[PDB]
Amino acid sequence: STCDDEPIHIPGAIQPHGLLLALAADMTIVAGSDNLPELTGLAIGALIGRSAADVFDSETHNRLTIALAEPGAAVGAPITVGFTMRKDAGFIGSWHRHDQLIFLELEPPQRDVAEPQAFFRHTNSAIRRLQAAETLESACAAAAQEVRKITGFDRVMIYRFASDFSGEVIAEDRCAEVESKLGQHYPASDIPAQARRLYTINPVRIIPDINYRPVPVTPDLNPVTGRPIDLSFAILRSVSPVHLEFMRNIGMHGTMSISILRGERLWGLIVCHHRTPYYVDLDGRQACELVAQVLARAIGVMEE
């Protein structure tokens, strides 16, 4: 376990392309990313231990209050965000009720959004083409082709693993400019235990610049538990510089990867790489999110 030891879940930093705010269970600001001042225009060391009401507009707190005290408490779905300071901003992104804190992840207004009809088109065709569920090999390739058709990543591919957690690429499509790993296998050390354990419970992962400077999370002391701040579900979660190397190697300054859950069990991953630094509309992500959700289902009617 030269590999499986790293605490990648508690690195106490996020990627700069958005920010984070962590509230205690009585709705008071507890910790944030240190770039908070840069964009919302509010100084961290001030915020620490004051009210979430100082940052959000009155609805976003209220939509917040209802969502959380909703029964079936869990890492929340995406929310619409407006700040009292810089309302204009209209940042939009998720929240996450883990660690006995309420994490808010906020993203910059994804300008130049997916054309509607084209969107519905690709979403709908895929769910037909995948549900049309030809073989396993197409079901998958399909997902990759379609996924590439939605996002427009330079190369995309379905990765499955054996019971010894070594995987094979079992599908592909590429911009005719980069090799097909369609025949390669890889060793379980490559995506190791703790990262397999993490993908099972949070099925989206996105890195836009592999060449980034991590935005510390301050404090990174969980006030309720007194352990570092645990960034499992955070899609802004700073990433193990080892792996980053391995993406520099294979020549890709952006990634994203989606789990393929098969009854609590991680069957395989959609895996995307893009030469230069590349982002995804929540649209873009939730689409793919969908692809793998159906695929996983168009695997649970191929398993009978």
Ligand SMILES: *C/C=C1/C(=C/c2[nH]c(/C=C3[NH+]=C(/C=C4\NC(=O)C(C=C)=C4C)C(C)=C\3CCC(=O)O)c(CCC(=O)O)c2C)NC(=O)[C@H]1C
């Ligand atoms: C022994 C340590 C190693 C290691 C650790 C490591 N790697 C990751 C993350 C990923 N590695 C991936 C592998 C691939 N990328 C590809 O291009 C291909 C295909 C040829 C594979 C199989 C991938 C996709 C990931 C996940 C990244 C993503 O979500 O897009 C981690 C986890 C890092 C984190 O979650 O913060 C770790 C600890 N890297 C190695 O290559 C070996 C030597």
